[PDB]
């Protein structure tokens, strides 16, 4: 898989964004994975990649000068994974998602704690992406 | 939402150490910031992420804390630090600010310079009359004024306003305007402005005769 | 060289909408977020929300979601905020600020835009002199002034001798009565210098485009 590269890059930022004794309120819920696997799955996934690339990661990079390059590295890897599909097979037949909107609104309400929460759940994100592809 | 609680007002003298507390209703980890807003100006960032000094800000300013308890410290404080200080958090949405802490600079007591002014002929030719009484450069802030017309107190038609503490001499000034019709004004003779301030045991009196 | 230039003060009627702008310069516009803040007279600061110029993505304070709409014009480095269904509660000073993405704190602010929500039309002020009734020999200093009466809306600006005289000046906060504002401004000078040396207040009420001078002379 080309996900190993993405998972490698994420292992490098995992520790930084991981947070303690929080009542583990999951941001990337089952509904999102359900959306990824449904009729508008392609659109939900493309929107989530866009959201991470344009709204999450650039904010994540500014949390600490020492984590910046590694966040940017993860971003490049995500952009690559994108192109890989975005310009090839049936993995992105599309050019909305209730679940995704819910994620953005929850993220917004969490503000900066939201940046850390979204980054720490990136492994869950890759898993949902994997779940998506393992279904085509 | 995260509520930030900071004291409404504090008084301190130049040269001393001043600390302002800000308490959040829930943890904001290290994301507490401070602003200084002087009268007539937009807020200026002083401290970010609890203890980092914003560029251009003097080293007399520092901050500390994490979680729910934070403190802004100005050491030594000086006369032009009179302003309102705000704490603000960014860890939780929405971003929220404390209600502001107004900082007063203590100085030696200073008596008001009192001046009374009759209505202008320009205004009179208009049917209206405003009498003005000024109490300039005093300290402490508490002060009161009483208008007397031919010895009778006039409580109606009076509006006052006080300036913000001066950044240089740390005093306040107050203006009191007595509004009355031209007819009213021309039916009396002695106009008096009486001022009560801790700098004098008896009232300061200024008058004119129409 | 970072600068946020806001559009002009606005007197608007209840129920209408108004669109404010914030023109950015001195930095790469798409590298930073534009935030909007509200400060009502009385001074409490409230955050309205932000917009990421690169994508248009927004984050609104729930309290302003039905009141404000943020937009950007990447091509002109300009951010906008439209306030709708205006009420007197929306009268305030609105400011745009620049934020590093992910660092929601504000080192740079626009100059602010004052929004006044009212059915009333502008009224220019009448300017009256404040000069001593009598007994001008008992003091080394003399205090003179100007009464700026009956204007709307705020603000007015007062200077002395075209700005050349700033020492000893006190311009007091305006007071509101029956829908009109009134304020006084005084200046204190050595009594041996007046009236030989002139003392004139210069009053400007931008909303009515009025500029007036009132030379203070002995009664």
XYZ file of C-alpha atoms in Angstrom:
565
model
C 0.000 0.000 0.000
C 1.002 3.649 -0.485
C -0.553 4.191 2.918
C 2.602 2.960 4.639
C 4.297 6.209 3.640
C 1.411 8.189 5.080
C 1.417 6.068 8.215
C 5.187 6.496 8.581
C 4.899 10.277 8.276
C 2.089 10.331 10.847
C 4.063 8.233 13.349
C 6.427 11.211 13.408
C 3.755 13.638 14.707
C 1.592 11.270 16.711
C 3.291 11.910 20.032
C 3.143 15.689 19.723
C -0.629 15.885 19.142
C -1.689 13.032 21.403
C -3.592 14.383 24.432
C -4.240 12.900 27.904
C -7.208 11.939 30.117
C -9.857 13.428 27.884
C -13.118 11.475 27.931
C -12.031 10.301 24.461
C -14.716 12.176 22.519
C -14.109 10.894 19.011
C -14.135 13.546 16.256
C -13.976 11.143 13.291
C -17.059 9.059 14.101
C -18.609 5.881 12.684
C -21.050 8.036 10.676
C -18.095 9.440 8.719
C -16.826 5.985 7.869
C -20.432 5.132 6.984
C -20.437 8.099 4.616
C -17.110 7.038 3.110
C -18.631 3.658 2.302
C -21.900 5.016 0.917
C -23.289 6.496 -2.286
C -21.538 9.840 -1.812
C -18.363 8.182 -0.443
C -16.083 9.650 -3.077
C -17.253 13.165 -2.272
C -16.985 12.734 1.505
C -13.404 11.469 1.126
C -12.320 14.169 -1.283
C -13.845 16.736 1.095
C -12.051 15.292 4.117
C -8.708 15.302 2.319
C -9.339 18.922 1.318
C -10.300 19.815 4.902
C -7.108 18.262 6.302
C -4.895 19.847 3.674
C -6.406 23.330 3.726
C -7.850 23.873 7.208
C -6.254 21.404 9.636
C -2.632 20.962 8.693
C -1.670 24.578 8.081
C -2.988 25.376 11.559
C -1.265 22.293 12.985
C 2.075 23.505 11.579
C 1.908 26.698 13.663
C 1.548 24.995 17.033
C 5.322 24.532 17.426
C 8.288 25.338 15.110
C 9.722 21.898 15.776
C 6.639 19.991 14.575
C 6.174 22.133 11.444
C 8.380 20.263 8.993
C 6.911 16.918 10.049
C 3.360 18.204 9.670
C 4.267 19.604 6.258
C 5.829 16.238 5.358
C 2.585 14.462 6.261
C 0.728 16.972 4.114
C 2.912 16.294 1.077
C 2.339 12.574 1.523
C -1.412 13.186 1.692
C -1.320 15.290 -1.486
C 0.561 12.467 -3.176
C -1.875 9.774 -2.059
C -4.538 12.079 -3.460
C -2.999 12.516 -6.923
C -2.302 8.787 -6.940
C -6.079 8.241 -7.023
C -7.265 11.681 -8.141
C -5.564 10.922 -11.468
C -5.852 7.195 -12.130
C -8.422 4.562 -11.154
C -12.064 4.344 -10.086
C -11.121 5.478 -6.586
C -12.270 9.056 -7.194
C -15.083 8.957 -9.824
C -16.301 12.280 -8.418
C -15.161 15.844 -9.178
C -22.844 16.713 -0.011
C -21.703 15.027 3.211
C -23.747 15.514 6.364
C -21.066 13.691 8.385
C -18.291 15.896 7.030
C -20.230 19.052 7.872
C -20.705 17.702 11.386
C -16.954 17.148 11.633
C -16.169 20.701 10.533
C -18.646 22.187 12.984
C -17.347 20.053 15.868
C -13.792 20.967 14.881
C -14.651 24.665 14.815
C -16.251 24.489 18.259
C -13.099 22.804 19.641
C -10.961 25.654 18.284
C -7.242 25.042 19.016
C -7.927 21.872 21.031
C -9.672 20.900 17.764
C -6.412 21.180 15.780
C -4.761 18.727 18.198
C -7.736 16.415 18.213
C -7.970 16.278 14.397
C -4.261 15.656 14.039
C -4.201 12.880 16.671
C -7.063 11.081 14.929
C -5.268 11.146 11.609
C -4.450 7.453 12.072
C -8.206 6.843 12.263
C -8.462 8.940 9.079
C -6.007 6.735 7.175
C -7.931 3.707 8.467
C -11.170 5.115 7.053
C -9.345 5.850 3.796
C -8.062 2.278 3.787
C -11.574 1.033 4.554
C -12.765 3.097 1.573
C -10.256 1.625 -0.878
C -10.550 -1.917 0.493
C -14.063 -1.551 -0.898
C -13.189 -1.130 -4.585
C -18.140 28.569 26.351
C -15.080 29.363 28.430
C -15.789 32.235 30.829
C -12.765 34.306 31.876
C -12.906 36.113 35.199
C -10.682 39.114 35.850
C -11.030 41.854 38.461
C -12.982 44.895 37.223
C -10.551 47.437 38.650
C -7.166 47.811 40.360
C -5.212 50.770 41.692
C -1.423 50.847 42.126
C 1.348 53.490 42.316
C 4.149 54.114 39.772
C 7.208 52.034 40.536
C 5.306 49.205 42.232
C 4.570 45.646 41.067
C 1.108 45.010 39.670
C -0.452 41.595 39.015
C -3.788 40.934 37.295
C -5.397 37.555 37.632
C -7.555 35.882 35.019
C -9.335 32.646 35.784
C -10.987 30.430 33.152
C -14.086 28.299 33.842
C -12.302 25.339 32.215
C -8.732 24.590 31.209
C -7.283 26.464 28.217
C -3.892 24.760 28.704
C -1.339 27.476 27.759
C -3.592 29.454 25.422
C -4.243 32.607 27.433
C -3.308 35.949 25.940
C -3.316 39.565 27.207
C -4.076 42.927 25.606
C -3.670 46.520 26.710
C -6.233 49.023 25.400
C -5.583 52.673 26.062
C -8.369 55.231 25.618
C -9.028 56.074 22.010
C -6.895 53.152 20.828
C -7.390 49.633 19.464
C -6.189 46.777 21.761
C -2.454 45.920 21.708
C -1.180 42.371 22.318
C 1.160 42.189 25.323
C 1.561 38.539 26.170
C 0.700 35.423 24.137
C 0.463 31.769 25.191
C 0.554 32.718 28.902
C 4.160 33.904 29.136
C 5.602 35.072 25.815
C 6.311 38.732 25.341
C 4.910 40.183 22.128
C 7.528 41.941 19.987
C 7.773 45.664 20.674
C 6.395 45.262 24.196
C 8.609 46.369 27.094
C 10.194 43.748 29.357
C 8.404 45.271 32.375
C 5.450 43.146 31.174
C 5.401 39.391 31.862
C 2.821 36.636 32.294
C 2.571 33.195 33.878
C 0.147 30.330 34.431
C -1.436 27.359 32.658
C -4.735 25.480 32.883
C -7.254 27.818 34.571
C -5.125 30.296 36.496
C -3.087 33.038 34.877
C -1.459 36.313 35.847
C -0.242 39.357 33.969
C 2.532 41.198 35.784
C 3.728 44.750 35.199
C 6.897 45.446 37.199
C 7.513 48.256 37.695
C 4.230 49.843 36.618
C 4.319 53.512 35.455
C 1.831 56.383 34.894
C 1.157 55.747 31.197
C 0.154 52.152 31.887
C -3.305 53.428 32.864
C -5.618 51.487 30.569
C -7.922 48.502 30.450
C -6.253 45.066 30.299
C -8.012 42.070 28.766
C -7.269 38.361 28.977
C -8.411 36.144 26.054
C -8.337 32.381 25.473
C -8.009 30.439 22.203
C -8.036 26.781 23.338
C -11.845 26.412 23.193
C -14.463 27.801 20.804
C -15.606 30.463 20.589
C -12.578 32.592 21.397
C -13.590 34.575 24.478
C -12.296 37.572 26.425
C -12.390 38.532 30.085
C -14.488 41.609 30.929
C -11.394 43.785 31.268
C -9.480 45.155 34.224
C -9.271 48.946 34.389
C -5.888 50.015 35.802
C -5.717 53.190 37.866
C -2.420 54.831 38.801
C -2.340 56.273 42.280
C -0.750 59.681 42.825
C -0.754 62.315 45.573
C -4.155 63.936 46.224
C -4.742 66.902 43.951
C -7.425 69.516 44.284
C -9.575 70.410 41.315
C -9.084 73.657 39.443
C -12.689 74.924 39.190
C -14.018 77.223 36.444
C -17.582 78.405 35.762
C -18.831 79.793 32.440
C -21.991 81.738 31.587
C -24.032 80.912 28.451
C -22.805 82.667 25.310
C -24.732 85.528 23.762
C -24.639 83.382 20.617
C -26.558 80.638 22.375
C -28.939 83.038 24.161
C -30.071 84.533 20.868
C -31.242 80.963 20.263
C -33.574 80.676 23.246
C -31.354 78.224 25.063
C -28.874 78.562 27.891
C -26.161 76.164 29.085
C -23.949 76.997 32.047
C -20.726 75.097 32.321
C -18.610 74.180 35.296
C -15.187 72.553 34.949
C -13.162 70.684 37.617
C -9.776 69.950 36.154
C -6.777 67.822 37.120
C -7.838 66.286 40.407
C -7.214 63.043 42.256
C -8.745 60.808 43.711
C -11.595 60.238 41.256
C -14.564 60.616 43.593
C -16.008 64.098 43.332
C -19.432 65.776 43.253
C -20.852 69.032 42.065
C -23.873 71.026 43.016
C -25.394 73.881 41.059
C -27.048 76.685 43.058
C -29.090 79.499 41.525
C -29.714 82.442 43.857
C -28.990 80.012 46.656
C -31.388 77.288 45.553
C -30.052 73.866 44.524
C -30.879 73.002 40.901
C -30.860 69.206 40.395
C -32.717 69.090 37.078
C -31.011 69.634 33.712
C -27.551 68.561 34.855
C -25.229 66.229 32.938
C -21.602 65.476 33.789
C -18.768 63.519 32.209
C -15.304 62.585 33.456
C -12.166 62.155 31.359
C -10.067 58.991 31.435
C -7.111 59.203 33.834
C -4.299 61.285 32.291
C -1.357 59.137 31.082
C 1.101 61.830 32.212
C -0.030 63.386 35.495
C -2.499 60.677 36.566
C -5.322 63.142 37.306
C -8.987 63.218 36.173
C -11.138 66.110 35.004
C -14.886 66.597 35.014
C -17.270 68.787 33.140
C -20.793 69.554 34.376
C -23.360 71.261 32.151
C -26.555 72.860 33.475
C -29.171 73.284 30.763
C -32.086 75.664 31.168
C -34.214 77.837 28.885
C -33.289 81.423 28.114
C -36.339 82.618 30.105
C -35.334 80.539 33.127
C -31.764 81.793 32.909
C -32.753 85.416 32.648
C -35.020 85.195 35.703
C -32.168 84.600 38.174
C -28.956 86.371 39.106
C -26.370 84.370 41.002
C -25.070 81.186 39.463
C -22.859 78.960 41.570
C -20.930 75.799 40.974
C -19.948 74.073 44.275
C -17.471 71.257 44.252
C -16.875 68.634 46.904
C -13.590 66.702 46.892
C -11.524 65.074 49.625
C -8.817 67.727 49.191
C -10.987 70.270 51.042
C -13.226 70.034 54.118
C -15.561 72.693 52.751
C -16.865 73.010 49.139
C -14.929 74.903 46.437
C -17.216 77.630 45.149
C -17.155 79.525 41.828
C -19.862 81.945 40.779
C -20.858 84.676 38.377
C -23.708 87.146 38.339
C -25.841 87.377 35.203
C 4.223 47.300 6.912
C 1.301 45.020 7.750
C -1.888 47.076 7.535
C -5.629 46.438 7.754
C -7.614 49.350 6.316
C -11.277 49.357 7.188
C -14.191 51.015 5.365
C -15.812 54.160 6.833
C -18.156 54.770 9.731
C -21.785 53.869 8.902
C -25.097 55.301 10.151
C -27.714 52.730 9.205
C -31.412 52.170 9.810
C -32.900 49.438 12.026
C -33.796 46.394 9.941
C -31.331 47.137 7.167
C -28.004 45.441 6.527
C -24.523 46.891 6.115
C -21.375 45.386 4.626
C -18.003 46.300 6.162
C -14.653 45.839 4.453
C -11.066 45.274 5.533
C -8.355 45.861 2.944
C -5.077 44.060 3.746
C -1.597 45.052 2.610
C 2.031 44.467 3.619
C 1.916 40.681 3.619
C 0.775 37.689 1.556
C -3.011 37.830 1.973
C -3.696 34.095 1.676
C -1.139 33.129 4.375
C -3.248 34.502 7.259
C -6.844 34.424 8.515
C -9.069 37.470 8.889
C -11.009 37.661 12.167
C -13.736 40.096 13.150
C -14.307 41.458 16.646
C -17.099 43.515 18.248
C -16.658 46.087 21.011
C -19.786 47.757 22.311
C -19.541 51.099 24.094
C -18.745 49.983 27.631
C -15.795 48.085 26.159
C -16.471 44.324 26.321
C -14.692 42.568 23.377
C -16.483 39.744 21.559
C -15.101 37.486 18.833
C -17.407 37.088 15.806
C -15.428 34.572 13.778
C -12.763 34.036 11.181
C -12.437 33.312 7.494
C -9.492 31.617 5.770
C -8.895 33.729 2.588
C -7.313 30.891 0.675
C -10.415 28.721 0.792
C -13.227 30.845 2.123
C -13.670 28.378 5.028
C -15.307 30.058 8.069
C -15.603 29.538 11.824
C -18.412 31.587 13.463
C -19.046 32.227 17.140
C -22.477 30.586 17.557
C -23.739 33.866 19.024
C -23.230 35.668 15.683
C -24.214 32.987 13.235
C -27.565 34.578 12.430
C -26.151 38.110 12.435
C -22.895 38.096 10.516
C -21.645 36.779 7.211
C -17.925 36.757 6.435
C -16.551 36.711 2.885
C -13.231 37.457 1.160
C -12.070 38.650 -2.239
C -8.693 36.960 -2.721
C -8.102 39.007 -5.866
C -8.255 42.330 -4.012
C -6.918 41.218 -0.611
C -10.181 42.341 0.961
C -12.276 40.784 3.682
C -15.933 41.620 4.293
C -18.432 41.218 7.069
C -22.095 41.780 6.440
C -24.384 42.433 9.383
C -28.092 41.870 8.761
C -31.437 42.754 10.358
C -29.780 45.552 12.319
C -31.025 46.552 15.757
C -29.630 48.993 18.313
C -27.785 46.010 19.871
C -25.557 45.907 16.790
C -24.348 49.495 17.280
C -20.652 49.088 18.078
C -17.083 49.382 16.878
C -16.186 46.462 14.613
C -12.580 45.502 13.931
C -10.815 43.068 11.661
C -7.625 41.435 12.861
C -5.001 39.268 11.250
C -4.338 35.813 12.620
C -1.570 33.302 11.938
C -3.549 30.157 11.069
C -3.953 28.124 14.226
C -2.824 30.954 16.522
C -6.034 32.768 17.402
C -4.520 35.822 19.051
C -4.140 39.256 17.539
C -0.974 41.333 17.054
C -2.480 43.393 14.215
C -5.824 45.204 14.184
C -7.659 47.269 11.601
C -8.461 50.821 12.747
C -12.060 49.898 13.519
C -15.351 50.888 11.922
C -18.140 52.449 14.007
C -21.659 51.248 13.153
C -24.552 53.332 14.494
C -28.013 51.808 14.126
C -30.685 54.495 14.215
C -33.705 55.931 12.390
C -32.410 59.472 13.062
C -30.604 61.592 10.482
C -27.322 63.432 11.016
C -27.443 66.753 12.849
C -24.393 69.009 12.769
C -23.320 70.663 16.060
C -23.644 74.299 17.174
C -20.367 75.482 18.727
C -20.457 78.001 21.564
C -17.620 79.749 23.336
C -16.733 79.190 26.993
C -15.136 82.421 28.314
C -14.851 83.740 31.929
C -17.611 85.951 33.219
C -15.215 88.055 35.290
C -12.461 88.612 37.856
C -9.522 87.927 35.509
C -6.527 89.101 37.579
C -6.546 86.587 40.413
C -4.683 83.826 38.554
C -1.631 83.169 36.411
C -3.621 80.775 34.200
C -6.979 81.067 32.411
C -9.190 78.218 31.190
C -11.232 78.679 28.011
C -13.326 76.271 26.000
C -15.964 75.327 23.472
C -19.387 73.750 23.982
C -20.238 71.496 21.016
C -23.963 71.008 21.275
C -26.644 68.919 19.659
C -24.964 66.624 17.205
C -25.601 63.144 15.878
C -24.118 60.638 15.448
C -20.721 60.413 17.206
C -17.899 61.300 16.828
C -16.692 64.901 16.675
C -13.054 65.880 16.835
C -11.770 68.954 18.614
C -8.406 70.604 18.222
C -7.014 73.898 19.482
C -5.275 76.440 17.236
C -5.324 73.956 14.358
C -3.550 71.348 16.404
C -0.562 73.509 17.383
C -1.810 73.835 20.997
C -2.185 70.451 22.722
C -0.764 71.066 26.184
C -3.380 71.812 28.856
C -6.309 70.536 26.780
C -9.204 68.426 28.149
C -11.858 67.125 25.723
C -14.617 65.456 27.761
C -16.745 62.472 26.776
C -19.952 63.455 25.017
C -23.298 62.965 26.823
C -26.491 61.883 25.054
C -29.870 63.484 25.670
C -33.006 63.375 23.557
C -31.059 61.730 20.748
C -28.380 64.415 20.536
C -24.835 64.528 21.874
C -23.092 67.417 23.569
C -19.478 67.717 24.695
C -17.079 70.360 25.994
C -13.331 70.842 25.435
C -11.202 73.244 27.453
C -7.675 74.558 27.160
C -5.670 76.272 29.893
C -3.096 78.940 28.958
C -1.098 81.619 30.881
C -3.526 84.486 31.515
C -0.950 87.051 30.325
C -1.241 85.432 26.855
C -4.965 85.905 26.224
C -6.454 87.691 24.450
C -3.214 88.959 22.891
C -2.464 85.453 21.591
C -5.552 83.937 19.934
C -7.305 80.749 21.151
C -9.598 79.002 18.679
C -11.214 75.576 18.812
C -11.553 73.661 15.541
C -14.550 71.349 15.524
C -15.166 68.617 12.965
C -18.259 66.448 12.665
C -17.358 64.075 9.809
C -20.874 62.564 9.523
C -22.296 65.935 8.455
C -19.030 66.970 6.772
C -18.917 70.042 8.958
C -15.789 71.899 10.099
C -16.112 74.922 12.358
C -13.765 77.290 14.139
C -14.775 79.293 17.161
C -12.343 81.982 18.260
C -12.615 82.573 22.008
C -12.776 86.302 22.862
C -13.280 88.172 26.141
C -16.891 88.752 27.095
